[PDB]
């Protein structure tokens, strides 16, 4: 088992529903074509995850105000926390590529939002760290997620045109998720 | 000369400052290289704005749940509201590329967020319309903004390298802005 990974068995049903998801997919221009290309992206990325993780957490570690969110009270990174979260992030790369975006998927999107937010941050791994990840950075991180995945999507010999379809699908899917994760951050009724 | 366009003359100072901005630029991987290329993007886009606007508002207009946010209470689109906003969106394309990202800029970023939010929506143009734009869609729209801009960035004969750099700069800058606009939506203390 991956500790903390509770896909399909969360405590709560998401407050947003499949019709909400349909309308949000429309807003990010995500279609069945992107379902196909995000699956292809998974096939490309899967055996590269260790490098992807080093690249991603190397970016987070590169700026003290970002690494901050994994820190103990003494301002140093909590290595237990980083390591446990890293295994769930690795799984999220696969889930984004391989799951159907169905009710179980939506329920886990609510869960991941809750875990970045003060509602559930630091509970999954039972760590002492900062209480909330400022929403400004959740939105910001759509960009570095896509810039991180880009070079890996080209490393299996796909043409620029195919890489572009995978990259755009990943961009749409990442934006879609962060949009959903806003729920616990946003004043009730404003989401 | 643009009705409702009050850049430099907002009633409020922004609740985020230049240090917040520096740290958020770092979160979207924005550097002096992007300053060069966002300015080049403006030079490329400036004389294409009518077609860009037709494309963008064509996208909004093609989805009833998005066009919704410009409708009168009787459910029908308010074309005056659309037209007035269109003029300020046109200017935003130039501002994104030409303004220093400084205090005045931050003040107007807070203003734009307030205008999508119930705080100020429908006041600028003195219209009667939907009270609030749900934040889920503001995040989602990062994607179709970038997808709208992309083809136009190639239309002045720049090299593929330069077009990609302009596109990435636009994506960083759009993400940066939507992150800032979240302020009035986000539970107090969670931004
Ligand atoms: C596009 C935005 C982001 C994506 C795609 C992303 C992805 C993920 C994933 C997949 C997980 C594990 C979820 C699970 O428990 O199964 C996670 C957890 C976490 N992320 Fe992010 N994340 C984003 C934004 C942020 C930001 C802005 C930070 C700031 C450094 C950050 C820091 C963390 C931390 C500290 C956790 C553990 C939260 C907890 O205590 O449960 N993430 N993230
Ligand atoms: C990336 C996200 C978005 C961008 C870049 C964007 C851009 C803009 C700009 C530049 C303006 C005029 C600002 C001014 O007053 O100077 C504006 C206003 C407006 N936008 Fe957006 N927008 C975004 C999201 C949305 C969404 C999700 C909707 C839903 C259709 C929308 C609908 C409108 C409406 C109705 C107004 C007028 C608000 C008011 O009454 O003042 N926008 N937008
Ligand atoms: C989040 N990593
Ligand atoms: C907003 N358009």
Numbering used by the authors:
A (entry chain A), B (entry chain B): 5 to 195
Which passages does the manuscript contain on this structure?
Protoglobin (Pgb) is a recently discovered haem-protein with distinct structural and functional features that make it unique within the globin superfamily.
The other two mutations considered, Leu(142)G4Ala, localized at the proximal site just on top of His(120)F8, and Ile(149)G11Phe, adjacent to Trp(60)B9 in tunnel 1, do not produce any significant deviation in the overall conformation of the distal site and in the cyanide binding mode relative to the MaPgb*(III)-cyanide structure. off for cyanide dissociation from cyanide-bound MaPgb*(III) and Leu(142)G4Ala and from the Ile(149)G11Phe ferric mutants, all characterized by ligand stabilization through two H-bonds (to Trp(60)B9 and Tyr(61)B10), are lower than those reported for ligand dissociation from the Tyr(61)B10Ala and Trp(60)B9Ala MaPgb*(III)-cyanide species, characterized by ligand stabilization through one H-bond. Overall, the single mutations do not affect significantly the tertiary structure of the mutated proteins, which are always closely similar in their backbone to that of MaPgb*(III)-cyanide, displaying rms deviation values which range between 0.17 Å and 0.49 Å, calculated for 190 Cα atom pairs.
